[PDB]
């Protein structure tokens, strides 16, 4: 059953966001979403997101995912949005029949962790997820518990909160 996207007031932006310190590779240490469940029959494997900062302050983004038979590489463009640390996908704005996305860097210290909020307008509904990013594949219990509390504050129950399994293939 449907969990609505939270109001943007509940999704803070990191203060004094430094786009040139947020660049580089991040591992998805945690993932929570309104359409993501923990799947014990096929537990999510760790994946990675690489942020390349461009001269115009967009990010060219590479997503690296481990599939059974290959490494998958997907590509996005995060274009500067309405606030520092907010981006839209491919520069496409919110519109009443239209596929679009939003990105918000909620919290980060740049050299260890981040939490990032993502939302898309998909088939006339809002789909959202939060990544707990690490510069390494492991983070402290404390940071994971903070991610759990933030995820819950957005209305996500516990079985919508996932910790992808650390692996070496594809993401190194």
């Amino acid at each position: 059953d449907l969990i609505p996207a939270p109001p943007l007031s509940k999704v803070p932006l990191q203060q004094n966001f430094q786009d040139n310190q947020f660049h580089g590779k991040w591992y998805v240490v945690g993932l929570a979403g309104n359409e993501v469940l923990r799947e014990d029959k096929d537990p999510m494997k760790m994946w990675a997101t690489i942020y390349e900062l461009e001269e115009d302050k967009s990010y060219n983004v590479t997503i690296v995912m481990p599939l059974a038979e290959k490494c998958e590489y997907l590509f996005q463009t995060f274009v500067p949005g309405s606030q520092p640390g907010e981006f839209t996908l491919g520069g496409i704005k919110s519109g009443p029949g239209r596929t679009s996305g939003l990105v918000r860097v909620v919290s980060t210290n740049y050299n260890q962790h981040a939490m990032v909020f993502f939302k898309v307008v998909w088939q006339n509904r809002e789909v959202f997820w939060v990544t707990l990013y690490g510069r390494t594949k492991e983070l402290t219990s404390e940071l994971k518990e903070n991610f759990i509390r933030f995820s819950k504050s957005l209305g996500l129950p516990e079985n919508h909160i996932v910790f992808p399994v650390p692996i070496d293939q594809c993401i190194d």
């Binding site: 993932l31 979403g33 309104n34 359409e35 993501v36 469940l37 923990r38 799947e39 999510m44 994946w47 997503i63 995912m65 998958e72 997907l74 996005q76 996908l89 596929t99 996305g101 993502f118 898309v120 998909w122 088939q123 789909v127 997820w129």
Partner: peptide, 25 residues
């Protein structure tokens, strides 16, 4: 004329509990 599919990266959307490209149909 050329067909230009509208696709985005999503965790969810066309596939619950999976992250990948979803294209609007």
């Amino acid at each position: 004329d050329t067909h230009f599919p509208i696709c985005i990266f999503c965790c969810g959307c066309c596939h619950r509990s999976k992250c990948g490209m979803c294209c609007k149909t």
